[PDB]
Amino acid sequence: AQCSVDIQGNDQMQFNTNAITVDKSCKQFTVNLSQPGNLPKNVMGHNWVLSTAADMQGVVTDGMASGLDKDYLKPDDSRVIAHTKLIGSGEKDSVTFDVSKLKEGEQYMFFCTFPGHSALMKGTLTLK
Amino acid sequence: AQCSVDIQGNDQMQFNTNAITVDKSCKQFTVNLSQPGNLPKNVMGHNWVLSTAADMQGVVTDGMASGLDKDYLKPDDSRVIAHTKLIGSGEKDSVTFDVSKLKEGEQYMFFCTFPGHSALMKGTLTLK
Amino acid sequence: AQCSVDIQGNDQMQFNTNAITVDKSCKQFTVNLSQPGNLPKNVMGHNWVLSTAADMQGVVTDGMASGLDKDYLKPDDSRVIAHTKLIGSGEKDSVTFDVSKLKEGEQYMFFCTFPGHSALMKGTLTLK
Amino acid sequence: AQCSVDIQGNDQMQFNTNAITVDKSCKQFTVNLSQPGNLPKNVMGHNWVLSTAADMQGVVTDGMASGLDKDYLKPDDSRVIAHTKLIGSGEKDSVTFDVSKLKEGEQYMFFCTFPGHSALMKGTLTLK
Ligand SMILES: [Cu+2]
Ligand SMILES: [Cu+2]
Ligand SMILES: [Cu+2]
Ligand SMILES: [Cu+2]
């Protein structure tokens, strides 16, 4: 609602939303991530990473190779527009980015880079 | 929250929650279902059906055999404790049920009976 | 084997293979898709579509927006290297494509673009 | 060939077969599982568990909760007909079960109980 959304990854390896629309009138957008289940981050840790639909596979491939030590994301990956940290059960993290970094007409995807999760834990983001 | 929950079934064949807790102080519990997407019910229609974990397969099987006109649910199926109608994009439907029909110590599952959807559209309901 | 493969999509939204190897000596390669199930194409239609692993998500998103009469594929989608049409119960279709449209090394994916199906219906194709 | 099948589960949560046919003439049947991948047991561990289709959801829920050291299976779960251990990268494990445990006219499902996996890692087993 407004320029923010609350997203949560769960023990079923699913996100509560698979589509986000950021209104043109937002200077910034905030994503508050929560993990309501009871599984440790090493078994079911989730994060929210945003890139272009085109960069999704690269980020996911380089990400799952970095280990949970690096939250399953290549450090200083340029394709990642914004991301949360990798959290487990009971944790929460928020990320805020400037809407100036998104152009109308392009397709973005948000996803979880923890091994295998991106199969279900993905979704669309669009600036309208 | 209180004795109602709002559930969304979306166009990527996912519910927004896969676990529901019904407080024992609720005499009645209310599920409000909405379809936030743009696809029609003949293609991506969703409902919320409740049964025990044990009956889920029997209900899903007899259900997809009944067709769209029967909301993909078998009429007078005694395994269903409560259910919505099958809704499409933009539609909404609520169903209140009596919490005295659930008991402590039983595993219940909620699911969508539209063909194939219960693989991802399923979740737990337990009384507490 | 050699320059043809046969594949079946079923009512549980599963292809009977996860990987297709294309012998680099094949001039053209045929894929023969069949739907042995009972569900109609509007409820469980399956097609076989081929793109690079990087372009698949774009193809899946523009696909579901194009509707059933367009086989849930964007018309003249540059990223689609080859594709069958959407078939329902009983039906079969093939596509024969030129093998020089694939370069080796690169990763390719085959998947179904009918709504919600690609999360379960996908696999890899390698030129070997 | 013989009363045996050899099955793989890859790092992308996919078993290499959706269906297993057990010829009625076998006294016992053996499944030989291999995880031909690079990811370890705690991240992408897989197992082959067998139950009737009606019991699968119960097995998965109670399995999830049991933890890795219990191979994500409730100890002495009467609904589990047969199962392998939970394995990871380059491991193999076999299970042999009496075909007398199965009666025809009942539907069986094989699946992985590692968290999240069950929805994608599944298939049917039938007696012929
Ligand atoms: Cu995750
Ligand atoms: Cu549904
Ligand atoms: Cu399909
Ligand atoms: Cu597994």
Q: Are B17 and B7 in contact (CB under 8 A)?
A: yes
Shortest alpha-carbon distance between residue C126 and chain D (Å): 16
Nearest residue in D to A121, CA atom = D116
D25 to chain C nearest CA, in Å?
A: 25
Distance from the alpha carbon of residue D119 to the mean position of ligand 4, in angstroms: 10
CA dist., res. D110 & res. B111, Å (int): 21
Nearest to C48 by CA among C78, C11, C89, C92: C92
Residue whose token pair is 């337990």: B126
Give dist(CA A14, CA A35) in Å, integer: 10
Would the annotation count B46 as a binding residue? yes
Q: Choose the closest CB to A10 out of B10, B18, B120.
A: B18
A3 is in an annotated binding site: no
Residues with CB under 5 A from ligand 4 (ion): D 46, 112, 114, 117, 121
* Whether the Cβ atoms of residue B97 and residue B50 lie closer than 8 Å to each other: yes
Q: How far is CA A49 from CA A72, A107, A109, C44, in A?
A: 10, 14, 8, 31
User: What is the number of CB-based contacts under 8 A between chain C and chain D?
Assistant: 13
Helix, coil or strand: residue A100: helix
Of A55, A45, A52, the C-alpha closest to A113 is: A45
CA–CA separation, B49 and B110 (whole Å): 5
Contact C16 D18 (CB under 8 A): yes
Question: CB distance B56–D61 less than 8 Å?
Answer: no
**Ligand 4 mean position, distance from CA D118 (Å):** 7
Q: Where do we find the tokens 């099958």?
A: B86
Single out the residue of C88, A124, D126, D52 nearest to residue B115, CA to CA.
C88
CB C35 within 8 A of CB C90: yes
Nearest to C100, CA basis, from C6, C22, C1: C22
Nearest to D61 among B57, B58, B107 (CB): B107
CA-nearest residue to C53 within chain A is A57
C72: left (phi over 0), alpha (psi -120 to 50) or beta: left
Nearest to D54 among B57, B107, B119 (CB): B57
d(CA C19, CA C53): 13
From the CA of B17, how many Å to the nearest CA of chain A?
6
Cβ atoms D47, D118 nearer than 8 A: no
Kindly determine whether residue B43 and residue C13, on different chains, have CB atoms separated by under 8 Å. Answer: no
DSSP one-letter code for A68: G
Residue C18 Cα, gap to closest chain A Cα (Å): 14
Distance CA D13, CA B95 (A): 36
**Tokens encoding B44:** 């991506």
**Structure solved via:** X-ray
In angstroms, what is the span from residue A125 Cα to ligand 1's centroid? Answer: 18
Nearest chain D residue (CA) to C122: D14
Neighbouring-strand partners of residue C110: C50, C123
Look at A43 and D13 and tell me if their CB atoms are within 8 Å.
no
Closest CA to B22 of B37, B4, B41, B6: B4
CATH superfamily of A1-128: Cupredoxins -  blue copper proteins (2.60.40.420)
**DSSP β-bridge partners for residue A126:** A21
Residue D122 sits at φ, ψ, to 5 deg, of: -160, 165
Residue type, B127: L
Measured CA to CA, the distance from residue D8 to residue D19 in angstroms comes to 13
Q: Which residues contact D64 (CB under 8 A, 6 or more apart)?
A: A11, A39, D72, D113, D115
**Domain definitions of chain A by residue range:** 1-128
Chain C contacts in chain D segment 18-77 (CB below 8 A): 18-19
Single out the residue of D38, D113, D43 nearest to residue A113, CA to CA.
D43
- Specify the long-range contacts of residues D58-61, CB closer than 8 Å, at least 24 apart: D58/B53, D58/B54, D58/B107, D59/D111, D59/D113, D60/D111, D60/D113, D60/D118, D61/B53, D61/B107, D61/B124
Query: What are chain D's partners, defined as 3 or more CB pairs within 8 angstroms?
Result: A, B, C
Resolution in units of Å: 2.1
Grouping H, G, I as helix, E, B as strand and the rest as coil, residue A63 is helix
Q: Cα torsion at C6, C10, C12, C17 (round to 10°)? A: 0
**How far is the alpha carbon of A54 from chain C, nearest alpha carbon, in Å?**
6
For every residue of A4-16, DSSP letters joined together read: EEEEEB-TTS-BS
Which of D58, D24, D51 has the alpha carbon at shortest distance from D111? D51
3-class DSSP assignment, residue C45: coil
Contact list, B14 vs chain A (CB under 8 Å): 14, 18, 120
- B109 among annotated binding-site residues: no
* Residue B26 annotated as lining a ligand binding site: no
Chain D interface test: which of A10, A14, A39, A43 (most D C-beta within 10 Å): A43
**Measured distance CA(D51)–CA(B104) in Å, rounded:** 25
| Residues whose CB is less than 8 angstroms from the CB of residue C8 and which lie 6 or more positions away in sequence, other chains included | C15, C16, C33, C34, C35, C36
